[PDB]
Scaffold this active site. Sequence first.
Site, mmCIF file in Angstrom:
data_model
loop_
_atom_site.group_PDB
_atom_site.id
_atom_site.type_symbol
_atom_site.label_atom_id
_atom_site.label_comp_id
_atom_site.label_asym_id
_atom_site.label_seq_id
_atom_site.Cartn_x
_atom_site.Cartn_y
_atom_site.Cartn_z
ATOM 1 N N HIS A 1 0.844 -1.297 0.007
ATOM 2 C CA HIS A 1 0.034 -0.127 -0.120
ATOM 3 C C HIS A 1 0.797 1.226 -0.090
ATOM 4 O O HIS A 1 0.298 2.180 0.074
ATOM 5 C CB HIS A 1 -0.952 -0.115 1.172
ATOM 6 N N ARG B 1 6.385 -6.110 3.581
ATOM 7 C CA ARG B 1 4.990 -6.235 3.539
ATOM 8 C C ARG B 1 5.020 -6.842 1.986
ATOM 9 O O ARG B 1 4.776 -5.489 1.285
ATOM 10 C CB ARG B 1 4.012 -5.562 4.267
ATOM 11 N N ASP C 1 16.552 -12.291 -2.136
ATOM 12 C CA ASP C 1 17.991 -11.991 -2.574
ATOM 13 C C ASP C 1 18.347 -10.643 -2.191
ATOM 14 O O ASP C 1 19.605 -10.509 -2.009
ATOM 15 C CB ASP C 1 18.085 -12.298 -3.838
ATOM 16 N N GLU D 1 -6.929 -11.363 7.208
ATOM 17 C CA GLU D 1 -7.809 -10.127 7.096
ATOM 18 C C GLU D 1 -8.913 -10.242 6.067
ATOM 19 O O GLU D 1 -9.255 -9.560 5.060
ATOM 20 C CB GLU D 1 -7.052 -8.957 6.280
ATOM 21 N N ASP E 1 -8.587 -4.322 6.344
ATOM 22 C CA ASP E 1 -9.010 -5.408 5.537
ATOM 23 C C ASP E 1 -10.190 -6.067 5.993
ATOM 24 O O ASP E 1 -11.136 -6.478 5.410
ATOM 25 C CB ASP E 1 -8.074 -6.064 4.471
HETATM 26 MG MG LIG Z 1 -4.393 -5.341 4.835
#
Ligand SMILES: [Mg+2]
Lengths: 253, 253, 253, 253, 253, 253
Positions: free
Chosen positions: F47, F72, F86, F150, F176
């Site tokens: 996001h 994330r 990597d 979520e 979410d």
């Molecule tokens: Mg989320």
Amino acid sequence: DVFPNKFKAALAAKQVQIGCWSALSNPISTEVLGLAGFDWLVLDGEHAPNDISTFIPQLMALKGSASAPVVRVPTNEPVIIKRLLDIGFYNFLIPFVETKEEAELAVASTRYPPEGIRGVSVSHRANMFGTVADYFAQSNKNITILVQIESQQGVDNVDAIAATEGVDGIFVGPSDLAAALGHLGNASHPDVQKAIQHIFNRASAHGKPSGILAPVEADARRYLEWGATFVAVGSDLGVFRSATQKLADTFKK
Amino acid sequence: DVFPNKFKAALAAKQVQIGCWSALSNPISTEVLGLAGFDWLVLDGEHAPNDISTFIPQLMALKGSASAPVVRVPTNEPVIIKRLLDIGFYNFLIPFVETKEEAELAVASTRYPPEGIRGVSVSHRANMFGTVADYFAQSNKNITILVQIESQQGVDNVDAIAATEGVDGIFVGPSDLAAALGHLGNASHPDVQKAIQHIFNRASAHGKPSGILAPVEADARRYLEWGATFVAVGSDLGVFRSATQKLADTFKK
Amino acid sequence: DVFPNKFKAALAAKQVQIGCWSALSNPISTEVLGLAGFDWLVLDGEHAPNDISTFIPQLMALKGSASAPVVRVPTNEPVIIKRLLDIGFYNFLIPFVETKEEAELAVASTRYPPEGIRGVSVSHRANMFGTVADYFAQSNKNITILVQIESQQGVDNVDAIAATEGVDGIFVGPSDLAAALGHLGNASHPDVQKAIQHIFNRASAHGKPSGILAPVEADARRYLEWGATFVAVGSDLGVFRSATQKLADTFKK
Amino acid sequence: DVFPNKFKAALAAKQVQIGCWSALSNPISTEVLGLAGFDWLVLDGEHAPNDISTFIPQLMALKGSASAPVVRVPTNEPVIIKRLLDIGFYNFLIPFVETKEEAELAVASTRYPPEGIRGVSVSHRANMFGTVADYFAQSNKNITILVQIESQQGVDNVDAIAATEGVDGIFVGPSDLAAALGHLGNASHPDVQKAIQHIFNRASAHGKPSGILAPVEADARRYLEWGATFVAVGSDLGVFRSATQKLADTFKK
Amino acid sequence: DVFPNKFKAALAAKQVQIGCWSALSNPISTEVLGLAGFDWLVLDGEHAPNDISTFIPQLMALKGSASAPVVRVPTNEPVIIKRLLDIGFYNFLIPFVETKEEAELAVASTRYPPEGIRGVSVSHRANMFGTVADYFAQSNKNITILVQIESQQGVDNVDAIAATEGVDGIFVGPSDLAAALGHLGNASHPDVQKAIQHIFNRASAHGKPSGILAPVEADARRYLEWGATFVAVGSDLGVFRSATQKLADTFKK
Amino acid sequence: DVFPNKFKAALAAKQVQIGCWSALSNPISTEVLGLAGFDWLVLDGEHAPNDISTFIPQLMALKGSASAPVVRVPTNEPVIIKRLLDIGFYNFLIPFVETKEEAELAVASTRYPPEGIRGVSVSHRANMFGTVADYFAQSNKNITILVQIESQQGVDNVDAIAATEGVDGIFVGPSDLAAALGHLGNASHPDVQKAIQHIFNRASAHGKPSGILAPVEADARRYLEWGATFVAVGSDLGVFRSATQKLADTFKK
Ligand SMILES: [Mg+2]
Ligand SMILES: [Mg+2]
Ligand SMILES: [Mg+2]
Ligand SMILES: [Mg+2]
Ligand SMILES: [Mg+2]
Ligand SMILES: [Mg+2]
């Protein structure tokens, strides 16, 4: 001033929207491009070297421009659309939309649950970091979805695609359509021309505006006469190439 | 390949060289610009957002182009010239050259001792990391120095400047010259036109070619008739701004 | 829109202008900073890793923000000022202004001839590529010059500096002033506080507003009481460092 | 951790410090370079495309490396040194130091008043945003100044330069010295070799260590025998060019 | 000079092609790498920090190099291949090619309809913005497809894969193959060695050249003796790491 | 010092880990963020405008920070995970983990065969270019996998997900989850609160620690009381927005 989406409304009102493609992938020239007065500008992420890293600089360059920014995604998949939404794009051009299901997925990719599957974040460029009023609710009704009909399957299912809720416009991608019909590099062929008008006509049958990319003026005007309303009449790259070449040629000894 | 410097030779032969200014400061559009066929392209470091970080990408974009890259330095000082030489520039446009001494300093800044004061490095883009044959010796005889006469003092000292060894061309900067003569934004004023012709005449008197920037075709053609040989007939920025606005106007009036 | 310069007008009216310093040198955080509502933001080019390559992205990030962008140049010299003007800066903070001559030079660096020595270019961000009306004429009357008094000589010559035409504001740089007075890292020392008040008094005597950077609220409020009007009350960096440490401490003690 | 400056201490102790030059100007290769174990690495800002925009990424790449980062400034002037200090450089290589005054100016440029003229900022990479203990005081005693003797005047004034307080090391720039002595591209000429030995001797006479750049092993070993202690034995660029060509040659002859 | 693809032809002619991997992900070192004379260079997009943003700068850096650029895609999927084609890559290395279907998809991803599914754009780096003659037709016959056999499934289906029309070369990825056979980090194990020769032999059975990555000279020569022709003998990263470490070690006290 | 993964162990030991989200996507502010003392920092790639190009600079910025970097990912798919591994990430946060199969795939995406499907490369940031001891073996046991629950499906299968080998933590994404339960923008709704505690409780039932993002202190403390241990208490973007706005408001007239 983020919402309501004026471009989305203009399209629905069947008003002609003159656009220009953008492939130069940089904020310097794009800032200049934003002064031209085009109704919409397509930041191409499918055939130009554009991506999140180049998109934000160009969106910032276009702040203050009357031109509505439209991103042409690299492909119709939920993840990149999720990411492009948060960086600030409110208008999308989806390549190769071939089935009703795919059209539905594209629409859903831009709407928060339960309407769609868009991932939720509380602060980003799209809601200008929490300063956009009633954002969560308004966003779901202010995203423009323009699907591209540019394959034989897409043509076969154009009615089901145009009938899909959330599909705001039916756009013809001439080059891919020509190739799909066995006429690579020759969109002017009679059979491709027939397919194009057929696409426009089916769009109309479902109350959706039609659009197309036509860098040759004569073609653009013919398409407009056929009923298309959101027509891209050229590209920053194409005009730059042509104009720079012409200037040099003018003085060629 | 790097040497001999063909552009420098063309100037010495008084052959016409059609150029185009560059301010878009990015490798994407500049690669396209290199296809136009201009004899020379000026990567502007004085009035455009260019710097070493943008210069190398654009020089790479121009590899293979027939256009001779020319850098217009931000100011006439040794240090930046030293740095611009090593990254791969062999042609220089020097702003505000107002005296014989300043002309000599610009030339010296591009030549290794004892002839000049250029700092020495054994590997860089300029000698393509040690692959340019007889580099140290040939470099000193292959750098083009174009001095800009664009101030009252520059005009007063045009003869001594043009007579300076190493000064390859006498370039007129219209905008600054007009401003210097009390006609800001009006280079077409007779006072300015007269000074330009005079500058061209004095360049010729000392066996040096003259040049000028003239984005208006009628102006460029007049200057060519007057005898200027290295004439920039536009800019990527001006061409882009004009061409994009024109395309939009064609459909929106 | 670009002109008239509202910030410049606000200063002339002696209206309070709350500012924030910026050193994070990136468009992402700066766009967020522009939402805070500060009257002015200083993009630091002297003590933060900012340069033309980072300045344009941040100026674009601030398009639409009510905050007036101000650039603090790396040093008081003509060339960089020439370049910063063309990329879109209309407000300048000049470090170490120690004499009347230096004040005059800073002003001159921002004005076209005959008033100043600013180099001329016909298209750039500053005149939004030729779309700013009556640009050349209006530009000369719409640039804000804020001089920094932060050295013993600057203090000695504060009257002549404040009396200089074109000097819009007298800004105190606490850290350098403290160091100059033999109190490095101790701007709160009486010797320094006394000099600050004196500087504020002399600015007022010559009809010019005074300003200062004061990240400590108590200090900022005292300076405002003393009569300073354009006061930077913090920095994005200081605010970020403090706020992040605070959040962590809240849970880790 | 930041202070005390171990590199500075090592030089004062006349301990051998093996270095490597860096011109690849990017964080990717430089992070790898930091693993080699060199005692010091010179991020070249004079003859390589490095600048503040490339310096910070590379300094971050070197965090944790045992190699002491040293920046070779583009020229000996206050402003850029001021900026390089704040971004995190504690060791400096100054090109073309030709007089006692220039040596003193370089030293002063790195020290806060009253000892020097370094501009003050309360938060930056150098004091790791306020986390370096007793920063202001300790900084003045922890900056390494390495002056380059690479010109005839520099050689003539080597004694006064080496005797200057704050000058931590006397570095010989082979290429510029050779050119200055009329042997461009031939540092091995006896005239040059003799000057180098002389420079080393005078550095020793004033209790200062001497250094030099010597990419040829035999040369580096000879200079070490002569008494030089901080010797750069190659460059990432030279090593890369040689190693890649070697690998190719192994299979293509 | 874009077409015909000389590399593709050399491969078909069974001529040995010596290559080098590239993971440094920057145009500076890659420009130097292009001077080594390798027959092909693999810009790794699967295990190195490369992407569209780094690929174009490196392709520009390689303009003029005799080395054929080859991109190793992050994965075998049509979208990224579509994008890499337009940015100017004419040679591809496809990781984990495990079935006939996957080999067919990789080939199709690079060919315009009806032969393949490649998306159509009329101007981009690949056709050098419309200057490449008979582009649409020639492109379909000038793209090199090198599939990687580096999994047990790939080995099981190597015959069907090598028999696929459009598959120009069978490349063994040693590290993944070793892991697949239960010998992670030990490609020299007898069973992996047997699998490698088996892959080479099946490639030959279908008239396709075989290749492999072998940074150890002894291995590279053994593979060449086994019949492999396009062999990558090292990497820019590997040689840089080794060479810089060796230089430092040579002087280690 | 790469292995063992201290963060992974701390989590297993059920020790509270205080974290902060990162969306500013740049190395300058992130370096500052690393000084705060958070136990973990989440570089958001789903996001926030982060990607490989921004990730490496920020990882370098965090070198020396006690904070454990956690990425994330944009989505749960093997390719981007392969690439992120990597570049140097050892801790992962996987969005929308809805089934046992998906949890298994996420774990496998980070482990070399035969345990997983991670692609093999012999030199990269993860093994610090070959300097990490017994890398291949140790890596498979030192990657932290944090799955996000979520969605309604994820809640339905939370037990099977938490029971999956390799799943080190069960993280609740509030926004979410709220949307999934028909309460977009209202995670405080009783039914969402119940779902959250249920998720925490099922995590505990399988011996896995639970975590969540809670920018409101009262919420963070409630979740901690409910048994959650790895709790993100805010974000760099959120605190920056709040803190800059507060500073401006404090002086608002
Ligand atoms: Mg989320
Ligand atoms: Mg298309
Ligand atoms: Mg001029
Ligand atoms: Mg100051
Ligand atoms: Mg030197
Ligand atoms: Mg492999």
